[PDB]
Structure 1
Amino acid sequence: FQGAMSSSIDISKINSWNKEFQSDLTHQLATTVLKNYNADDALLNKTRLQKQDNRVFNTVVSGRCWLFAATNQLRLNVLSELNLKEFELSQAYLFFYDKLEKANYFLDQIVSSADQDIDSRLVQYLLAAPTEDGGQYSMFLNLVKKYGLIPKDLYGDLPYSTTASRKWNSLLTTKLREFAETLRTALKERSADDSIIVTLREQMQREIFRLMSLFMDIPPVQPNEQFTWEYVDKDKKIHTIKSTPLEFASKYAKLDPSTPVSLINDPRHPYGKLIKIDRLGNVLGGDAVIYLNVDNETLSKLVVKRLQNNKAVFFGSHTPKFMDKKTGVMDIELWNYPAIGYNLPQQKASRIRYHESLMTAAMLITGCHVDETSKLPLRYRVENSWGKDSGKDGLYVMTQKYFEEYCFQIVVDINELPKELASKFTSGKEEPIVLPIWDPMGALA
């Protein structure tokens, strides 16, 4: 009894506390202002903004954020290779196959977890959001290795659902939840390899494809089928390229799928270890989401090194934590929360464990400023798919502390790594730390 009483909200206590707080001048001002405006709007610190909103970067390179971020370098490679003024790869092309493959992958996840109760943690998680739009770099390579890439000119963002996919996803998900029950019900009486189950699964793939084809057309050419693409170079001369999507991704966009690797700063785990997310994927049998865990000093140096190689860096962060979209500044001290006594001592590893921080989006680091001493990076230039309308004409500036605290993953080429880190990936000796499918270091918008 005494404990439950002490654990209860006591009306005398809260009214006594209220009297004490009302006697403090800062509190009086704070409650007046914060009953009038959104706290971020009220506390944005223009004195701090004035100093941090610095767009000089001494180290720079010459729509589903994850697809824009993963494809931008390849878009630039073509632009370069064909001497074009402007050029875009088709993000819709990858989006269509990503959804189809994920829906298909879900059927396989349901069959492989059919031994678990319907209310088990994994089966419920699988049923929660099987066809969402997010991905990861390995999920992007899985798609490009099977489907290749094509110019946006041949398959654009025309359909309603390419820019407002919520309804389409909900309709496909409702059907997938129906199918999971049909599969699980059929698996009680049979083995998965039973011809009846195999037939059921094919009919489901067919229904998924039929439904998807109502909202988007299947791309115009198969991966090994040639397309013809007519274009104008920066000088106004016309050309015609005949290529297949797979040849295009290699010959013109110069993607070598064997070079990219992901590094992450996940302080919940030992540095130097590989970390693998169980079950997270899109294409059945494709590669896993795997990261090499490293400290922030290492992560920061690799970003600078990649930038010096003249290549942008795909990174995963907790958007929009401490991100001001109007000014395009990512700074954890941009808002004066300490002035209302609101401080956050929880450290990175614990923020992750305690459901406070996770990866939510992919963006690109396209530049940075290394201190004009023999030194370190102070801030990064960041670009994303939102448009010149967001940020400062589309550009964001991120502080080194933001990168250390609210960013996690970067993608670099294996050749840019020190031999002892590169060997973590090449010498099949490493045993990864395997995390659940629902881990916060997962899919990115």
Structure 2
Amino acid sequence: SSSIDISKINSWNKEFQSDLTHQLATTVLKNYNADDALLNKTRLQKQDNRVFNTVVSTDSTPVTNQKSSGRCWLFAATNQLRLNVLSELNLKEFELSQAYLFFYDKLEKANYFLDQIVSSADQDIDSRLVQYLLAAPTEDGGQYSMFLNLVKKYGLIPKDLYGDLPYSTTASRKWNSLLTTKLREFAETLRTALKERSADDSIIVTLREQMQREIFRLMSLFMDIPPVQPNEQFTWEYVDKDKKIHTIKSTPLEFASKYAKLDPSTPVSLINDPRHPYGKLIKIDRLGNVLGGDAVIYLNVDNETLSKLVVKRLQNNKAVFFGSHTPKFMDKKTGVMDIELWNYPAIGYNLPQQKASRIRYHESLMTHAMLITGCHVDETSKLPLRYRVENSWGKDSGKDGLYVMTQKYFEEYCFQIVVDINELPKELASKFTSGKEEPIVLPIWDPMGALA
């Protein structure tokens, strides 16, 4: 019936043990990890292909490593931009400061959290929203819109002026824990004061300032505030590929446009969320980092268009920031991302659940942001077969830091790319520049609202 019957399971066992495939399966599966045991080398032999006919001219030098932090999104976003500096300044190796953005992102989220608590002060402490706000207020992960929020207010700077030196940039767990413990204390203090008074109250205003101050005080103990303010000048001496020395005096905000070539007004993030109609705008309620910054909004598009937008973008010599479900169907040793790389059907394990339902049923979401730097169209008259992916896990992960993702993987376990609005078809670009477009608003706890 609905309960586990002991006779029933022992009878099923008896039946399974009579099948030779099951006998072999239990023997091997009790010995090794399923992924290790089932890795299919016949398939690997064909899929581990590193020839890409369409690639970004500039090489990702050097391979970056986020270490023990969830700063992939910042690495990937800056990895896309570093290529412009590398190229425009004829540099052998170059990196924009990921830590720079990380410092400001964490400060802003702690501050942003306080406001979120204030705006939901009318809800019970045990409500879904309040408990959600309290879950991970300072997590490292983020979205592209959140990336632009920071670049708009703070600009970009070369890693040479501010790098991953502090312990907390490469091992952020403890720092976040200390901060979050305080914020949860502040959350209580704010709400309590909000029972008697209004937010506009002089007392509340004073209270929030003292919280902001302690938040900055604590963050400055683990990382130094960047050396220059956004509009403040910095001098950067460097050597080009020709062993020639140069000096650049700029400001974080000027450097971002002038050298990094970012016009914050052009990138838009396209998502592939099968639970909603395409051509529709999807907005994640409350998701953000900079209080007052822009909101996360995606244009929902089909995989056919998405695939093309990626090829065109690559052909226009630009890398493509994308978000997917790591490490689903990802072999870190080889760097292969193929949903058929492991022989699960040999053990009769099959998964018919569709993408939309996978998202709906708590099974798949975006968890990591990486960079597409190449692709390979079937050399004849067909379409893209695989893509070249640059990860931020050091040069030993995958094949010298690089991965290869199948088209099928792209369709199934990848949910987002970032393009410039001018690359979109008029029909799509308009959804961003029109007004009729009322976005489908999803809660903060929706799987597409789960950062990277």
Report the TM-score when normalising by structure 1. Answer: 0.98
* Structure 1 residue aligned with 2:330: 323
Asked if structure 2 preserves the Cα contact closer than 8 Å seen for 1:64 and 1:385, the reply is no
Cα deviation, 1:288-344, whole Å, max 9, x if unaligned, reads 111100111011110111001000100000000000000100000100000111000
- Corresponding residue number in structure 2 for 1:219: 226
Give the Cα–Cα distance (whole angstroms) in 2 for the partners of residues 330 and 88 of structure 1. Answer: 26
Report deviation, 1:443.
4.2
Counterpart pick for 2:27 among 21, 27, 32 = 32
1:18 matched to which residue of 2? Answer: 13
Cα distance, 1:444 vs structure 2:
3.6
- 2 CA distance for matches of 1:140 and 1:281? 10
Task: Give the distance between the partners of 2:449 and 2:236, measured in 1 at CA.
Answer: 36
Give 1:97's match in structure 2, choosing from 86, 93, 104: 104
TM-score by length of 2: 0.96
State how far apart, in whole Å, the 1-side matches of 2:315 and 2:21 are: 48
* CA RMSD, 1 decimal: 1.6
C-alpha deviation, 1:68, in angstroms? 1.2
Deviations 1:176-230 (A, max 9, x none): 0000000000000001100110000000000000000000000001000111111
**Which residue pairs with 2:158 in the alignment?**
151
Distance 2:241 2:37 in 1: 48
Q: Secondary structure at the match of 1:26?
A: helix
Worse-superposed segment, 78-87 or 21-30: 78-87
Q: Distance in 2 between matches of 1:49 and 1:81?
A: 38
Say if 1:276 and 1:288, in contact at 8 Å, map to a contact too.
yes
- Per-residue deviation at 1:74? 1.9
Q: Tell me how far apart the structure 1 counterparts of residues 12 and 54 of structure 2 sit (CA, whole Å).
A: 52
Task: Give the C-alpha shift of residue 241 in structure 1.
Answer: 1.0
Contact persistence 1:66–1:134 (CA under 8 A):
yes
Cα deviation code 1:231-260 (max 9, x no counterpart):
112112212111110011011111100110
Counterpart selection for 1:377 from 366, 378, 384: 384
Question: Aligned equivalents of 1:401 and 1:318: distance in 2?
Answer: 13
Kept after mapping to 2: 8 A contact 1:65/1:362: yes
1:390 aligned partner: 397
State the Cα deviation string for residues 363-404 of structure 1 (Å, max 9, x = none).
011111111223311111111101111001111111111000
After TM superposition, what 4+ stretches of structure 1 lie above 6 angstroms from structure 2? none
User: Residues 84 and 234 of structure 1 are in contact (CA less than 8 Å); yes or no, is this contact kept in structure 2?
Assistant: yes
CA deviations over 1:153-193 (Å, ceiling 9, x no partner): 10011000010000000000000000000000000000110
- Give the 3-state SS of the residue equivalent to 2:403 in structure 1: strand
Q: What do residues 42-67 of structure 1 show as CA deviations (whole Å, max 9, x unaligned)?
A: 00000110111111111111972111
Q: How many pairs are equivalent?
A: 440
Counterparts of 1:241 and 1:46 in 2: how far apart (Å)?
Answer: 51
User: Unaligned 5+ residue runs, structure 2?
Assistant: 57-68
Question: Does the residue aligned with 2:78 lie in a helix, a strand or coil?
Answer: helix
CA distance in 1, matches of 2:76, 2:19: 49
> Sequence identity, in percent?
100
Q: Please say if residues 80 and 371 of structure 2, whose CA atoms lie closer than 8 Å, have aligned partners that are also in contact.
A: no
**After the TM superposition, which of the residue ranges 61-70 and 228-237 deviates more from structure 2?**
61-70
| Contact 2:344-2:350 at 8 Å conserved across structures | yes
Q: CA deviation at 1:420?
A: 0.3
